[PDB]
Amino acid sequence: PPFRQVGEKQLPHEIIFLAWSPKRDLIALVNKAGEVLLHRLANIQRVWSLPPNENTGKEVTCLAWRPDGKILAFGLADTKKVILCDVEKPESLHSFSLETPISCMQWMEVNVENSVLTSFYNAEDEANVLLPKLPALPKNYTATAKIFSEEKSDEILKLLGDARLNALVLGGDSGQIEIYAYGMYKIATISEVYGSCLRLCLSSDLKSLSVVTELTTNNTPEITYFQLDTSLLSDYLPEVTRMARKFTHISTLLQYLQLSLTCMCEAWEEILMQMDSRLELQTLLMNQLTVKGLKKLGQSVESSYSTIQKLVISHLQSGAEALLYHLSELKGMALWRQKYEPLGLDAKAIEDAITAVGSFILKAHELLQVIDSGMKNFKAFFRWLYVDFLTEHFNEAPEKSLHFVKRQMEAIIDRCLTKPAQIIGASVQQKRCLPLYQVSASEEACPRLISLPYLWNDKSQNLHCVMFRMLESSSSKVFILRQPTDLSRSINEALLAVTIGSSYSCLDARFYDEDIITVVLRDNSEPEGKDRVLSQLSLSQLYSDEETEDEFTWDTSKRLEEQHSDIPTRTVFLENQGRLLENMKAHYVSVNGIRKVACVLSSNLRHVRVFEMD
């Protein structure tokens, strides 16, 4: 009676990751076969299926929904790469390699939109609408993915989302963390934890980065909570936002320049292959090649030259011009020092990079001069065989350091991009480390990324929250640890053990709306034990110091499991005692607060039951 059944489907293969789209009623899931599939809310209809291929990663470990729900990113542990693809088309729009194999993923965006941040968004929105679009790259067989192909609305304006800073944070099996702005610019590489990145959470204010890690040991892994001080990204937020944005533009270009140079080099290889296939003398020439065959070779060489000329006079000229534009502005920012210097922006490094772009466009101009001088001799040769002219006929019978200038250019651009990631990564300190518990024999049954502990941001009160199960201490109790984003702040009820009731045992719990959490429970009745409902977190927090104690009395050098005896116990009550029950063996949920949707995955059976909370 409380919630409405929308669909019920038995998935062919087991599911290792479940996630809802933040803006649409779509659910992304990993199929344990390494395939990622999309499903609609109504009757859980399969939208698409992305097969796992050896070419672009086989083992996919996690997913991430971009706040602007048009782009979906997923990490591959085997090939050590993150591939960003559209939600409508299976095709990948972007890809990048990672230092360590992926463990977990998070795609978040800043909740702060104060004064100068608003002035920046408006400026970037007006910059992109004013600056002329780059010339359309021709549809070539050598051109892979074809993002710059220009068909209706371009994918480059989709890849680069809103000016509002969104970060894609990646976790490793070693504990290494990587933060990618707009899901493409590396802001920080953090290596301050010990286990394998189980859960990741960057705060909306960018003050802290909480992480839950599963440390592998001889008998059973040890679940440990950590909190990192990423406050530099908070203090210099409008600068970090603008800085990363210009780097995503310089990353889009250079790649555009390389792809256009690839199309230019391939068109040159098409002339040399056709020339090699073509080339007493009077009889042999007319027998080897017909008079009709010279005409088809004439157009093929003329069309390839025109495209080569267009690629360097239009694509390369506008490409380098836009590169000179975005770098020149980055220097103007870099010249502040008070701002951008403690962020790692070196004016001299980019100044030298401008000259590198200038030397490249000039060397490309010098390369065209060689092609034009070579084509004028061929023009006199072609017209002579059909019917200044005689001189060019005699003279008739990568290169010119272009590979060197492109490498020197991308070398200085990369030094401009790498310096901030090194110094921002140096600024972040490990301020909190809380060993929780050691995994039980039963917890090793379900996948890492579906089960509890559950890390969430709580953007309303700015609190890093964790809901975990310590089975060795208690079988029916759910533990809730909440720490503020600003570490200097002292929180009231830092840790509690909530007994949920009756409904007794809590299997899975997930954040839904402002103060309420969705919860899957195990009732006293034996036939139908599995039942889902929403719980109000307001009942336990108490927001007042009890006997001048904020539960800071526990030893953070010893596991919290060891000191469970003196933990502050609480008893929470449900909105409906017997809300929605199901004949299936539930155990897990995936929810979306604003879209009022839910996805109940069955324990091991991988049968899914969807319900709308509206």
Coordinates of C-alpha atoms in Angstrom, one line a residue:
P1 CA 0.0 0.0 0.0
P2 CA 2.7 2.7 0.5
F3 CA 4.7 2.4 -2.7
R4 CA 3.7 1.5 -6.3
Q5 CA 5.2 -1.4 -8.3
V6 CA 6.5 -0.2 -11.7
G7 CA 8.3 -3.3 -12.9
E8 CA 9.7 -6.8 -12.1
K9 CA 12.4 -8.5 -14.2
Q10 CA 14.8 -11.5 -13.7
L11 CA 18.2 -10.2 -15.0
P12 CA 20.0 -13.0 -17.1
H13 CA 23.4 -12.5 -15.3
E14 CA 24.4 -11.4 -11.8
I15 CA 24.7 -7.6 -11.0
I16 CA 27.8 -6.2 -9.2
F17 CA 26.9 -2.5 -9.4
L18 CA 23.5 -0.6 -9.3
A19 CA 23.0 3.2 -9.8
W20 CA 20.1 5.6 -10.7
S21 CA 20.4 8.6 -13.1
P22 CA 20.2 11.8 -11.1
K23 CA 18.0 13.7 -13.7
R24 CA 16.2 10.8 -15.6
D25 CA 14.3 7.6 -14.6
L26 CA 17.2 5.4 -16.0
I27 CA 19.2 2.8 -14.0
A28 CA 22.8 1.8 -15.0
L29 CA 24.1 -1.6 -14.0
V30 CA 27.2 -3.9 -14.3
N31 CA 26.3 -7.5 -15.5
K32 CA 29.3 -9.5 -13.9
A33 CA 30.1 -10.6 -17.5
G34 CA 31.9 -7.2 -17.8
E35 CA 29.0 -5.7 -19.7
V36 CA 27.3 -2.4 -18.7
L37 CA 23.5 -2.1 -19.5
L38 CA 20.9 0.7 -19.2
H39 CA 17.3 0.2 -18.1
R40 CA 14.1 2.4 -18.1
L41 CA 11.9 2.7 -15.0
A42 CA 8.7 1.4 -16.7
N43 CA 8.8 -2.5 -16.7
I44 CA 12.7 -2.3 -16.4
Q45 CA 13.1 -2.2 -20.2
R46 CA 16.6 -2.6 -21.6
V47 CA 17.6 0.7 -23.4
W48 CA 21.0 -0.6 -24.6
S49 CA 23.8 -3.1 -23.9
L50 CA 27.6 -2.3 -24.2
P51 CA 29.5 -5.6 -24.8
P52 CA 33.0 -6.0 -23.1
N53 CA 35.8 -6.1 -25.7
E54 CA 39.6 -6.8 -25.2
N55 CA 40.3 -3.6 -27.3
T56 CA 38.6 -1.1 -24.8
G57 CA 38.5 -3.0 -21.5
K58 CA 36.9 -6.3 -20.4
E59 CA 36.6 -6.0 -16.6
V60 CA 34.4 -3.0 -15.5
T61 CA 34.4 -2.6 -11.7
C62 CA 32.3 0.6 -11.2
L63 CA 29.9 3.3 -12.8
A64 CA 29.4 7.0 -12.3
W65 CA 26.4 9.2 -13.4
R66 CA 27.4 12.8 -14.3
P67 CA 25.1 15.3 -12.5
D68 CA 24.1 16.5 -16.1
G69 CA 22.7 13.0 -16.7
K70 CA 23.8 13.0 -20.4
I71 CA 27.2 11.5 -19.9
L72 CA 28.0 8.2 -18.1
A73 CA 31.5 7.1 -17.0
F74 CA 32.8 3.7 -16.0
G75 CA 36.2 2.3 -14.9
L76 CA 38.1 -0.7 -16.0
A77 CA 40.5 -2.4 -13.5
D78 CA 42.2 -4.7 -16.1
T79 CA 43.2 -2.1 -18.8
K80 CA 43.6 0.7 -16.1
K81 CA 41.3 3.2 -18.0
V82 CA 38.1 5.3 -17.5
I83 CA 35.9 5.6 -20.6
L84 CA 33.3 8.4 -20.8
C85 CA 30.3 7.6 -23.1
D86 CA 26.9 9.1 -24.1
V87 CA 23.6 7.8 -22.4
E88 CA 21.8 7.7 -25.7
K89 CA 24.6 6.1 -27.8
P90 CA 26.9 3.3 -26.5
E91 CA 29.9 5.2 -28.3
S92 CA 32.7 6.6 -26.1
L93 CA 33.2 10.4 -26.2
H94 CA 36.4 10.4 -24.0
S95 CA 39.0 8.1 -22.5
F96 CA 42.1 8.3 -20.2
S97 CA 44.6 5.9 -18.5
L98 CA 45.0 5.6 -14.7
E99 CA 48.1 5.1 -12.5
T100 CA 46.4 2.3 -10.5
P101 CA 43.5 -0.2 -11.2
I102 CA 40.0 1.2 -10.3
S103 CA 38.3 0.1 -7.0
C104 CA 35.3 2.6 -6.7
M105 CA 34.0 5.8 -8.4
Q106 CA 32.2 9.1 -7.6
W107 CA 30.8 11.9 -9.8
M108 CA 29.9 15.0 -7.7
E109 CA 29.2 18.7 -8.4
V110 CA 29.6 21.8 -6.1
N111 CA 26.5 22.9 -4.1
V112 CA 28.0 26.4 -3.6
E113 CA 27.0 29.1 -6.1
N114 CA 28.1 32.4 -4.5
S115 CA 28.6 35.9 -6.1
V116 CA 31.9 35.6 -8.1
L117 CA 31.2 31.9 -9.1
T118 CA 27.9 33.2 -10.7
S119 CA 29.9 35.9 -12.6
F120 CA 32.3 33.2 -13.9
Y121 CA 29.5 30.8 -15.1
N122 CA 27.9 33.8 -17.1
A123 CA 31.3 34.7 -18.6
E124 CA 32.1 31.1 -19.8
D125 CA 28.5 30.8 -21.1
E126 CA 29.0 34.0 -23.1
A127 CA 32.6 33.0 -24.2
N128 CA 31.4 29.7 -25.8
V129 CA 28.4 31.4 -27.4
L130 CA 30.7 34.2 -28.9
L131 CA 33.8 32.3 -29.9
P132 CA 33.4 30.8 -33.4
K133 CA 33.2 27.0 -33.7
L134 CA 36.2 25.1 -34.9
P135 CA 36.1 23.9 -38.6
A136 CA 34.2 20.7 -39.2
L137 CA 36.6 17.7 -39.5
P138 CA 35.8 15.5 -42.6
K139 CA 34.3 12.0 -42.2
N140 CA 37.4 9.7 -42.6
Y141 CA 37.9 5.9 -42.1
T142 CA 41.1 6.8 -40.0
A143 CA 39.0 9.1 -37.7
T144 CA 37.9 7.0 -34.7
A145 CA 34.8 7.8 -32.5
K146 CA 34.2 11.0 -34.7
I147 CA 33.5 13.6 -31.9
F148 CA 34.6 16.6 -34.1
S149 CA 32.6 15.2 -37.2
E150 CA 29.9 18.0 -36.7
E151 CA 26.4 16.5 -37.1
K152 CA 23.6 18.7 -35.7
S153 CA 24.5 19.5 -32.1
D154 CA 28.2 18.7 -31.4
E155 CA 29.4 16.2 -28.7
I156 CA 32.2 18.6 -27.6
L157 CA 29.5 20.9 -26.0
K158 CA 28.1 17.7 -24.3
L159 CA 31.5 16.5 -23.0
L160 CA 32.2 19.9 -21.5
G161 CA 29.2 20.2 -19.1
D162 CA 28.0 23.3 -17.1
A163 CA 30.7 25.8 -16.0
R164 CA 29.7 24.6 -12.4
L165 CA 32.7 22.5 -11.3
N166 CA 31.9 18.8 -11.3
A167 CA 34.6 16.3 -10.1
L168 CA 35.1 12.7 -11.0
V169 CA 37.0 11.1 -8.1
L170 CA 38.6 7.7 -8.7
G171 CA 39.8 5.2 -6.1
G172 CA 42.4 2.4 -6.5
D173 CA 43.0 -1.1 -5.1
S174 CA 46.3 0.3 -3.5
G175 CA 44.5 3.3 -2.0
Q176 CA 45.5 5.9 -4.6
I177 CA 42.8 8.6 -5.3
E178 CA 42.6 10.7 -8.4
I179 CA 40.3 13.8 -8.9
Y180 CA 39.3 14.6 -12.5
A181 CA 37.5 18.0 -13.1
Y182 CA 34.7 17.9 -15.6
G183 CA 35.7 14.2 -15.8
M184 CA 38.8 15.0 -17.9
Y185 CA 41.3 17.3 -16.0
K186 CA 43.5 15.8 -13.2
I187 CA 43.3 18.3 -10.2
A188 CA 44.9 16.0 -7.6
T189 CA 46.6 12.6 -7.1
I190 CA 46.2 11.6 -3.4
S191 CA 48.0 8.7 -1.8
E192 CA 47.2 9.0 2.0
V193 CA 45.2 5.8 2.8
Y194 CA 46.3 2.1 3.3
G195 CA 43.5 -0.3 2.1
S196 CA 41.7 -0.7 -1.2
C197 CA 39.2 2.2 -2.1
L198 CA 35.8 0.7 -1.2
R199 CA 33.9 4.0 -0.8
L200 CA 34.7 7.6 -1.9
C201 CA 33.0 10.9 -1.1
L202 CA 34.1 14.5 -2.0
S203 CA 32.2 17.2 -0.1
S204 CA 30.0 19.7 -2.0
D205 CA 31.9 22.6 -0.4
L206 CA 35.2 20.8 -1.4
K207 CA 36.5 21.0 2.2
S208 CA 37.1 17.3 2.8
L209 CA 37.3 13.8 1.1
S210 CA 36.1 10.9 3.2
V211 CA 37.1 7.4 2.1
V212 CA 36.2 3.8 3.3
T213 CA 39.0 1.2 2.6
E214 CA 39.0 -2.6 2.6
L215 CA 42.6 -3.6 3.7
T216 CA 43.4 -7.3 2.6
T217 CA 44.9 -9.5 5.4
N218 CA 45.8 -13.3 5.8
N219 CA 42.4 -14.2 7.4
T220 CA 39.8 -11.5 6.8
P221 CA 39.9 -7.8 5.5
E222 CA 39.8 -4.8 7.8
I223 CA 37.2 -2.0 6.9
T224 CA 38.7 1.5 7.8
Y225 CA 37.3 5.0 7.5
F226 CA 39.6 8.0 6.4
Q227 CA 39.0 11.7 5.9
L228 CA 41.3 14.0 3.9
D229 CA 41.6 17.9 4.1
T230 CA 41.0 19.1 0.5
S231 CA 40.3 22.6 1.9
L232 CA 42.7 24.2 -0.6
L233 CA 40.1 23.4 -3.4
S234 CA 37.4 25.0 -1.1
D235 CA 39.4 28.3 -0.3
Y236 CA 40.4 28.8 -4.0
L237 CA 37.1 27.4 -5.4
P238 CA 36.3 30.2 -8.1
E239 CA 40.0 30.0 -9.2
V240 CA 40.1 26.1 -9.3
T241 CA 36.7 26.2 -11.3
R242 CA 38.0 28.7 -13.9
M243 CA 41.5 27.1 -14.0
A244 CA 40.2 23.5 -14.7
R245 CA 37.7 24.9 -17.3
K246 CA 40.5 26.5 -19.4
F247 CA 42.6 23.2 -19.2
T248 CA 39.5 21.2 -20.5
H249 CA 39.5 23.6 -23.5
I250 CA 43.3 23.2 -24.1
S251 CA 42.8 19.4 -23.7
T252 CA 39.9 19.4 -26.3
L253 CA 42.2 21.4 -28.7
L254 CA 45.8 19.9 -29.1
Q255 CA 43.7 16.6 -29.4
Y256 CA 41.8 18.4 -32.2
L257 CA 45.2 19.5 -33.7
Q258 CA 46.6 15.9 -33.4
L259 CA 43.4 14.4 -35.0
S260 CA 43.5 17.0 -37.8
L261 CA 47.3 16.3 -38.3
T262 CA 46.4 12.5 -38.4
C263 CA 43.8 13.2 -41.2
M264 CA 46.5 15.3 -43.0
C265 CA 49.2 12.5 -42.6
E266 CA 46.7 9.8 -43.7
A267 CA 45.7 11.8 -46.9
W268 CA 49.4 12.1 -47.7
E269 CA 49.8 8.3 -47.3
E270 CA 47.0 7.8 -49.8
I271 CA 49.0 9.7 -52.5
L272 CA 52.2 7.7 -51.8
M273 CA 50.3 4.4 -52.0
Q274 CA 48.6 5.4 -55.3
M275 CA 52.0 6.7 -56.7
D276 CA 53.8 3.3 -55.7
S277 CA 51.0 1.4 -57.5
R278 CA 51.5 3.5 -60.7
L279 CA 55.3 4.0 -60.7
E280 CA 60.3 0.8 -75.4
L281 CA 59.0 3.4 -72.9
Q282 CA 56.1 4.4 -75.3
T283 CA 54.7 0.8 -75.5
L284 CA 55.2 -0.1 -71.7
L285 CA 53.5 3.1 -70.4
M286 CA 50.2 2.6 -72.4
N287 CA 50.1 -1.1 -71.4
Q288 CA 50.8 -0.8 -67.6
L289 CA 48.4 2.2 -67.2
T290 CA 45.5 3.2 -69.5
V291 CA 44.6 6.8 -70.6
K292 CA 41.4 6.5 -68.5
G293 CA 43.5 5.3 -65.5
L294 CA 45.6 8.5 -65.5
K295 CA 42.3 10.6 -65.2
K296 CA 41.1 8.7 -62.1
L297 CA 44.6 9.1 -60.5
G298 CA 44.5 12.8 -61.3
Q299 CA 41.3 13.5 -59.3
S300 CA 42.4 11.3 -56.4
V301 CA 45.7 13.3 -56.0
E302 CA 43.9 16.7 -56.5
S303 CA 41.1 15.9 -53.9
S304 CA 43.7 14.6 -51.3
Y305 CA 45.8 17.9 -51.8
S306 CA 42.7 20.1 -51.4
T307 CA 41.8 18.3 -48.1
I308 CA 45.5 18.6 -46.9
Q309 CA 45.4 22.3 -47.8
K310 CA 42.0 22.8 -46.0
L311 CA 43.3 20.9 -42.9
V312 CA 46.3 23.3 -42.5
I313 CA 44.8 26.6 -43.8
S314 CA 41.4 26.2 -41.9
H315 CA 41.6 23.5 -39.1
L316 CA 45.2 24.0 -38.0
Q317 CA 45.1 27.8 -38.3
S318 CA 41.9 28.1 -36.2
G319 CA 43.1 25.3 -33.9
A320 CA 46.3 27.0 -33.0
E321 CA 44.5 30.4 -32.9
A322 CA 42.0 29.1 -30.3
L323 CA 45.0 27.4 -28.4
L324 CA 46.8 30.8 -28.4
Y325 CA 43.6 32.4 -27.1
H326 CA 43.0 29.9 -24.2
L327 CA 46.7 30.0 -23.2
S328 CA 46.9 33.8 -23.3
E329 CA 43.9 34.1 -20.9
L330 CA 45.5 31.3 -18.7
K331 CA 48.7 33.5 -18.5
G332 CA 46.5 36.5 -17.4
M333 CA 45.2 34.3 -14.5
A334 CA 48.7 32.9 -13.8
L335 CA 50.0 36.5 -13.5
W336 CA 47.9 37.1 -10.3
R337 CA 50.2 35.0 -7.8
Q338 CA 47.9 36.0 -4.8
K339 CA 45.5 33.6 -6.7
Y340 CA 46.5 30.7 -9.0
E341 CA 50.2 30.5 -7.7
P342 CA 49.3 28.4 -4.5
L343 CA 47.3 26.4 -7.1
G344 CA 50.3 25.8 -9.3
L345 CA 49.8 28.1 -12.3
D346 CA 53.2 29.2 -13.7
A347 CA 53.1 32.2 -16.1
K348 CA 56.6 31.4 -17.6
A349 CA 55.6 27.8 -18.3
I350 CA 52.6 28.9 -20.3
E351 CA 54.5 31.8 -21.9
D352 CA 57.0 29.3 -23.4
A353 CA 54.0 27.1 -24.4
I354 CA 52.5 30.0 -26.4
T355 CA 55.8 30.3 -28.4
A356 CA 55.6 26.5 -28.8
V357 CA 52.1 26.8 -30.4
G358 CA 53.4 29.7 -32.5
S359 CA 56.5 27.7 -33.7
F360 CA 54.2 24.7 -34.5
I361 CA 51.7 26.7 -36.7
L362 CA 54.7 28.3 -38.5
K363 CA 56.4 24.9 -39.0
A364 CA 53.0 23.7 -40.4
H365 CA 53.0 26.7 -42.7
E366 CA 56.6 25.7 -43.8
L367 CA 55.4 22.1 -44.5
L368 CA 52.5 23.4 -46.8
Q369 CA 55.1 25.4 -48.8
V370 CA 57.0 22.1 -49.5
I371 CA 53.7 20.4 -50.6
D372 CA 52.7 23.4 -52.8
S373 CA 56.2 23.5 -54.4
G374 CA 55.9 19.7 -55.0
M375 CA 52.3 20.0 -56.5
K376 CA 53.2 22.8 -59.0
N377 CA 55.8 20.4 -60.6
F378 CA 53.2 17.7 -60.6
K379 CA 50.6 20.1 -62.2
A380 CA 53.0 20.8 -65.1
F381 CA 53.7 17.0 -65.4
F382 CA 49.9 16.1 -65.5
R383 CA 49.0 18.7 -68.1
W384 CA 52.1 17.8 -70.3
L385 CA 51.2 14.1 -70.4
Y386 CA 47.5 14.9 -71.4
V387 CA 48.4 17.4 -74.1
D388 CA 57.9 27.6 -66.4
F389 CA 56.1 24.5 -67.7
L390 CA 59.3 22.8 -69.2
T391 CA 61.4 23.8 -66.1
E392 CA 59.0 22.1 -63.6
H393 CA 58.9 18.9 -65.8
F394 CA 62.8 18.5 -65.5
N395 CA 62.7 19.4 -61.7
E396 CA 60.0 16.7 -61.2
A397 CA 62.5 13.8 -61.8
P398 CA 56.2 13.8 -39.6
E399 CA 58.8 15.2 -42.1
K400 CA 60.6 18.6 -41.9
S401 CA 60.8 18.5 -38.0
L402 CA 56.9 18.6 -37.7
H403 CA 57.0 15.5 -35.4
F404 CA 59.6 17.5 -33.4
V405 CA 57.6 20.7 -33.0
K406 CA 54.3 18.9 -32.2
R407 CA 56.2 16.9 -29.5
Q408 CA 57.9 20.0 -28.1
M409 CA 54.5 21.8 -28.0
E410 CA 52.6 19.0 -26.2
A411 CA 55.7 18.7 -23.8
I412 CA 55.3 22.3 -22.5
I413 CA 51.4 22.1 -22.5
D414 CA 51.7 18.9 -20.4
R415 CA 54.1 20.6 -17.9
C416 CA 51.4 23.4 -17.5
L417 CA 48.8 20.7 -16.8
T418 CA 50.8 18.4 -14.5
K419 CA 52.2 21.1 -12.0
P420 CA 48.8 22.0 -10.4
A421 CA 47.9 18.3 -9.8
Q422 CA 51.3 17.7 -8.0
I423 CA 51.0 20.8 -5.7
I424 CA 47.2 20.4 -5.0
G425 CA 47.9 16.8 -4.1
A426 CA 50.7 18.0 -1.8
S427 CA 48.3 20.4 0.0
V428 CA 45.7 17.6 1.0
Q429 CA 46.5 16.1 4.4
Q430 CA 45.1 12.9 6.1
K431 CA 43.4 14.4 9.2
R432 CA 41.1 11.5 10.2
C433 CA 41.7 7.7 10.3
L434 CA 39.1 5.6 12.1
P435 CA 39.6 1.7 12.0
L436 CA 36.1 0.3 12.2
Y437 CA 35.8 -3.5 12.0
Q438 CA 37.0 -6.7 10.4
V439 CA 34.8 -8.4 7.7
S440 CA 32.8 -11.5 8.7
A441 CA 32.4 -14.8 6.7
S442 CA 28.9 -13.8 5.6
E443 CA 29.8 -10.2 4.3
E444 CA 32.3 -11.8 1.7
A445 CA 29.2 -13.3 -0.1
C446 CA 27.8 -10.1 -1.7
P447 CA 29.7 -7.7 -4.0
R448 CA 31.9 -4.9 -2.5
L449 CA 30.1 -2.0 -4.1
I450 CA 26.4 -3.1 -3.4
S451 CA 26.5 -3.8 0.4
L452 CA 26.9 -1.6 3.5
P453 CA 29.1 0.5 4.5
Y454 CA 27.4 3.3 2.7
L455 CA 29.2 6.7 2.3
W456 CA 27.2 9.9 1.6
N457 CA 27.7 13.7 1.6
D458 CA 24.5 15.2 3.3
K459 CA 24.8 18.5 1.4
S460 CA 22.2 20.2 3.7
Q461 CA 24.2 20.1 7.0
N462 CA 27.6 19.4 5.2
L463 CA 28.4 16.1 7.0
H464 CA 30.3 13.0 5.7
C465 CA 28.1 10.1 6.8
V466 CA 28.6 6.3 7.0
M467 CA 26.1 3.5 7.8
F468 CA 27.9 0.3 8.6
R469 CA 27.2 -3.2 10.1
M470 CA 29.5 -4.7 12.8
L471 CA 28.2 -8.3 12.8
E472 CA 30.7 -9.4 15.5
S473 CA 29.3 -6.8 17.9
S474 CA 25.6 -7.1 17.0
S475 CA 23.5 -8.9 14.3
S476 CA 20.4 -6.5 14.3
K477 CA 22.1 -3.1 15.0
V478 CA 23.1 -0.5 12.3
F479 CA 25.9 1.9 13.2
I480 CA 25.9 5.5 11.9
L481 CA 29.1 7.7 11.9
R482 CA 28.8 11.4 10.9
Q483 CA 31.7 13.8 10.7
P484 CA 31.6 17.5 9.4
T485 CA 33.1 18.5 6.1
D486 CA 35.0 21.3 7.9
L487 CA 37.3 19.3 10.3
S488 CA 37.8 22.3 12.6
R489 CA 34.0 22.1 13.4
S490 CA 33.0 19.8 16.4
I491 CA 30.0 17.6 15.6
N492 CA 27.4 16.6 18.3
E493 CA 26.5 12.9 17.9
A494 CA 29.5 11.7 15.9
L495 CA 28.6 8.0 16.3
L496 CA 25.5 6.1 17.3
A497 CA 24.1 2.5 17.2
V498 CA 20.5 2.7 16.0
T499 CA 18.2 -0.3 16.7
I500 CA 15.4 -0.1 14.0
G501 CA 12.0 -1.5 15.0
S502 CA 8.8 -5.2 14.8
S503 CA 11.3 -4.9 11.8
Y504 CA 14.5 -5.6 14.0
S505 CA 17.4 -6.5 11.6
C506 CA 18.5 -3.9 8.9
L507 CA 20.1 -5.4 5.7
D508 CA 20.5 -2.3 3.5
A509 CA 20.1 1.4 4.1
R510 CA 20.5 4.2 1.5
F511 CA 20.1 8.1 1.4
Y512 CA 16.9 9.3 -0.2
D513 CA 15.6 12.8 0.7
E514 CA 17.0 15.5 3.1
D515 CA 16.5 13.7 6.5
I516 CA 15.0 10.3 5.4
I517 CA 16.8 7.1 4.4
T518 CA 15.3 4.1 2.6
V519 CA 15.8 0.8 4.5
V520 CA 15.4 -2.9 3.7
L521 CA 14.5 -4.9 6.8
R522 CA 14.2 -8.5 8.2
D523 CA 10.9 -8.9 10.2
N524 CA 10.1 -11.5 13.0
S525 CA 7.7 -13.5 10.7
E526 CA 9.5 -16.5 9.0
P527 CA 7.7 -16.8 5.6
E528 CA 7.9 -13.1 4.4
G529 CA 10.8 -11.6 6.3
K530 CA 12.0 -9.0 3.7
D531 CA 10.3 -5.6 3.9
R532 CA 11.2 -2.1 2.7
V533 CA 10.3 1.4 4.1
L534 CA 11.7 4.9 4.7
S535 CA 13.2 5.9 8.1
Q536 CA 13.4 9.4 9.7
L537 CA 17.0 10.1 10.9
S538 CA 15.7 13.1 13.1
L539 CA 14.7 10.6 15.9
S540 CA 18.3 9.8 16.9
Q541 CA 20.7 12.8 16.3
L542 CA 19.4 14.7 19.5
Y543 CA 21.5 17.8 18.4
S544 CA 22.4 18.4 22.2
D545 CA 25.5 17.3 24.2
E546 CA 24.7 14.3 26.5
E547 CA 26.7 14.7 29.9
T548 CA 29.2 17.0 28.0
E549 CA 30.1 14.0 25.7
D550 CA 30.2 14.1 21.9
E551 CA 31.3 10.3 21.7
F552 CA 35.0 11.3 21.1
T553 CA 36.0 9.1 24.1
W554 CA 36.8 6.1 21.9
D555 CA 40.4 5.2 21.0
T556 CA 40.9 5.9 17.2
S557 CA 44.1 3.8 17.2
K558 CA 42.2 0.6 18.0
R559 CA 39.3 -0.8 15.9
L560 CA 35.8 0.6 16.9
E561 CA 34.6 -3.1 17.1
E562 CA 36.9 -3.6 20.2
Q563 CA 35.1 -0.7 22.0
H564 CA 31.4 -1.5 21.0
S565 CA 30.5 -2.2 24.6
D566 CA 30.5 1.5 25.6
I567 CA 28.8 2.8 22.3
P568 CA 25.8 5.1 22.7
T569 CA 22.7 3.0 21.9
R570 CA 19.5 4.5 20.3
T571 CA 16.1 3.1 19.2
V572 CA 14.5 4.6 16.0
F573 CA 10.9 4.1 14.8
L574 CA 9.6 3.7 11.2
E575 CA 7.0 5.9 9.3
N576 CA 4.9 2.7 8.8
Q577 CA 5.7 -0.4 11.0
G578 CA 4.6 -2.8 8.2
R579 CA 5.0 -0.8 5.0
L580 CA 5.9 -2.8 1.8
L581 CA 6.7 -6.5 2.0
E582 CA 7.9 -8.9 -0.8
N583 CA 7.9 -12.7 -1.4
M584 CA 11.5 -12.4 -2.8
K585 CA 14.7 -12.3 -0.8
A586 CA 15.5 -8.6 -1.1
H587 CA 18.6 -7.4 1.0
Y588 CA 19.6 -4.4 -1.3
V589 CA 18.2 -1.0 -2.6
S590 CA 19.2 1.8 -5.0
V591 CA 17.2 5.1 -4.7
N592 CA 16.8 8.6 -6.2
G593 CA 15.3 11.2 -3.9
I594 CA 14.3 13.9 -6.4
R595 CA 12.9 11.4 -9.0
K596 CA 11.1 9.4 -6.2
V597 CA 12.3 6.0 -7.6
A598 CA 13.7 2.8 -6.1
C599 CA 15.3 -0.4 -7.3
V600 CA 15.3 -3.5 -5.1
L601 CA 17.9 -6.1 -6.1
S602 CA 17.5 -9.6 -4.6
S603 CA 20.2 -11.4 -2.6
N604 CA 22.3 -13.4 -5.0
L605 CA 19.2 -14.3 -7.2
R606 CA 19.6 -10.9 -9.1
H607 CA 15.9 -10.5 -9.6
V608 CA 15.0 -6.8 -9.6
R609 CA 11.7 -5.2 -8.3
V610 CA 11.2 -1.4 -9.0
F611 CA 8.9 0.9 -6.9
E612 CA 7.9 4.5 -7.1
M613 CA 7.7 6.5 -3.8
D614 CA 5.4 9.2 -5.4

